[PDB]
Amino acid sequence: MRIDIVTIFPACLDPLRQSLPGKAIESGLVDLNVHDLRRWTHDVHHSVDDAPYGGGPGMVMKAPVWGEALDEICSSETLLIVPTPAGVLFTQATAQRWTTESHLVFACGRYEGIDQRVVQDAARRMRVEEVSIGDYVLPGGESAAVVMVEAVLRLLAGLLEGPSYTRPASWRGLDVPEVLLSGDHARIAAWRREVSLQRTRERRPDLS
Amino acid sequence: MRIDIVTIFPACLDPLRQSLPGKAIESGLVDLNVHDLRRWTHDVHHSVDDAPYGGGPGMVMKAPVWGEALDEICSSETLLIVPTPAGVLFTQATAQRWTTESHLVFACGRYEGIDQRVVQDAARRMRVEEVSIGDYVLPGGESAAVVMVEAVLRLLAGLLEGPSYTRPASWRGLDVPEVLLSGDHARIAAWRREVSLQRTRERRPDLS
Numbered sequence A, B: 001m002r003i004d005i006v007t008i009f010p011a012c013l014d015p016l017r018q019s020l021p022g023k024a025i026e027s028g029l030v031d032l033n034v035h036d037l038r039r040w041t042h043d044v045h046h047s048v049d050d051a052p053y054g055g056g057p058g059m060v061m062k063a064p065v066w067g068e069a070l071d072e073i074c075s076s077e078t079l080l081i082v083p084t085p086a087g088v089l090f091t092q093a094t095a096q097r098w099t100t101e102s103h104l105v106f107a108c109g110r111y112e113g114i115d116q117r118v119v120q121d122a123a124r125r126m127r128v129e130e131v132s133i134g135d136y137v138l139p140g141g142e143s144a145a146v147v148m149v150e151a152v153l154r155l156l157a158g159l160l161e162g163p164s165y166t167r168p169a170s171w172r173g174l175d176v177p178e179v180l181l182s183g184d185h186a187r188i189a190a191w192r193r194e195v196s197l198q199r200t201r202e203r204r205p206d207l208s
Ligand SMILES: CCN(Cc1ccc(CNC(=O)c2csc3nc[nH]c(=O)c23)cc1)C1CCCCC1
Pocket: A083, A084, A085, A109, A110, A111, A112, A113, A131, A132, A133, A134, A135, A136, A137, A138, A139, A140, A141, A142, A144, B161
């Protein structure tokens, strides 16, 4: 897999060189290139943003700049990913489907986002996805791209979770549930399913 | 605000020194300390994990190690945050509520997670939250802690979003909607509300 991340904060993608994503890169399973968007600006101040049409707070990322960068990096085979709070929710099923892609391109936005026409134009020659990682506001798309890349890479390198325990058997007056010490696989699997189900009912009823 | 992050991958929290979170730290609004969990291990291999009780794939993070670190870092005023796929969903409302906290402690887990008793014990003297950032599997909690910290810090430093546009008026045969060039605030606000509503119905009907 080839991954290209376009941003004005290249340093923010450095966690990808570490741990599991770093091993996937080093071993040759993933080619990861991080690009500073300012390398496609032709002005003296290297401007990437400009004032919104119709007014409003904040700035908008210029389409010509984004368009130039995407022209050089993408192909018709590219899956262009635009992290945004306006997108569809990223899920494990999305991570799973993205492991079948040959070339992922993450267009990380800053300010109030990227000019909508960058996406309309890109969609003329490639598949484009506007994706959110969850119902919260981030200052930019880089940390969301780390999350999305890590989820994909962990699958490449290969109900709510119940409680887990390890040694000691007793710690600060807290005992590991006796069932885990029973030596009975079937009783353990049934107990793990029940506790996983109770946690799901309590914390995520939408998952049941 | 004081933020303490406990992890075996301290380098993975480096994006927090950059951009908006870095400015919140530098200006004195946030004290951020990142701690290597291995500094609380007393063995020759600096082990933090051990085999699960009742078997299963993967390893579990030792409670004594975690307990020692939390004993030194936390107080009764601490809000202890444990990032986990078994937790409640992190949302903007959660980010907003956390801006009222004096001391946040993020216990970042690796392997199959942290011994459940670390949380039961911590809850004897402090408020504890088990929090997930979304319905996907990450290799660890560090990238989720960056996401959660960035959301909180962006609020400290201070329906789905519709499309945004900037100069030029026409780009690659794509025109900025005429309404944005009308000079009529009320027509613009009504159009932005309608497009925001149509996007929400299409991409996130659960939000309506
Ligand atoms: C006026 C539109 N918004 C601007 C905005 C656009 C883009 C961002 C940057 N976010 C991401 O790039 C992002 C990328 S993926 C993602 N997932 C969840 N949440 C996210 O914010 C993101 C931040 C603020 C507002 C900012 C907060 C107040 C109301 C919404």
